[PDB]
Write a protein that binds this ligand. Structure first.
Ligand SMILES: NS(=O)(=O)c1nc2ccccc2s1
Ligand SMILES: NS(=O)(=O)c1nc2ccccc2s1
Ligand SMILES: [Zn+2]
Length: 258
């Protein structure tokens, strides 16, 4: 936790302890919609969350994670650009201090108010720790949030945040259905990238949905009441916990749709 999103330890400093920060396959990136190629060989995504088992929600000092039982194939992502089966381990968000920033990926330089990451690991590697050491180890499904009407399926998340205000706090979070966080369309862009927080490993197939979900101002305002700090420490609101776009370098972004 020496790294963060503060005035002295933010993304521009990370390279000093994680030199891969200046690597060839870093995330997020700007998605230039005119340069992205429609790839008719890409398949529809298969999101199979009917048997998902959420367990717990944790403030880890950089975001909050809703954690799942990933001890068997009960919530998996397949298809799309992927070979094999990827198990859902957690989701979290990145968001801003105001609605005009917060997303990690951008679309023709447009920033959204927030971005949801549903993180999955390739079961061929047996565990998450092994998966992050492989170029096809993870699949992260990214979903933009814009501010408008409330997202009904987000409210259960919103309402527990008071109970995990500070770093290291957790709470039971069973029976949550992550299907309630999806947009209508599963059209997507995809490219090879990285984890966007340390250790920044280049192990991710990114799948970024084109259609944002709408959340209310009141919902995102509650994200912004969380704290980066621990209990009793000087209050530092958990806002602007997003990494900016990184150089695309020698990478092709592909679109699943015309
Ligand atoms: N972002 S980092 O290289 O991990 C980092 N920045 C800082 C600033 C002050 C003290 C420790 C660290 S560690
Ligand atoms: N923000 S993200 O690329 O989805 C992500 N980064 C990290 C870093 C360490 C462990 C898990 C994840 S998931
Ligand atoms: Zn993330």
């Amino acid at each position: 936790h020496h790294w963060g999103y503060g005035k002295h330890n933010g993304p521009e400093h990370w390279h000093k302890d994680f030199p891969i920060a200046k690597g060839e396959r870093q995330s997020p990136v700007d998605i230039d919609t005119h340069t992205a190629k429609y790839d008719p060989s890409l398949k529809p995504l298969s999101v199979s969350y009917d048997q998902a088992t959420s367990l717990r929600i944790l403030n880890n000092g950089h975001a909050f994670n809703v954690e799942f039982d990933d001890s068997q194939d009960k919530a998996v992502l397949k298809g799309g650009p992927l070979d094999g089966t990827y198990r859902l381990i957690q989701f979290h968000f990145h968001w801003g201090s105001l609605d005009g920033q917060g997303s990690e990926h951008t679309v023709d330089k447009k920033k959204y108010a927030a971005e949801l990451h549903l993180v999955h690991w390739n079961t061929k590697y047996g565990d998450f720790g092994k998966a992050v050491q492989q170029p096809d180890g993870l699949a992260v499904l990214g979903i933009f949030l814009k501010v408008g009407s409330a997202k009904p399926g987000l409210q259960k998340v919103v309402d527990v945040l008071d109970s995990i205000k500070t770093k290291g706090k957790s709470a039971d979070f069973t029976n949550f259905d992550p299907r309630g966080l999806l947009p209508e369309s599963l059209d997507y862009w995809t490219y090879p990238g990285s984890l966007s927080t340390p250790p920044l490993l280049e192990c991710v197939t990114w799948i970024v949905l084109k259609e944002p979900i709408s959340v209310s101002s009141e919902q995102v305002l509650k994200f912004r009441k969380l704290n980066f700090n621990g209990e009793g420490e000087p209050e530092e609101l958990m806002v602007d916990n997003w990494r900016p776009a990184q150089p695309l370098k020698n990478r092709q972004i592909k679109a699943s749709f015309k």
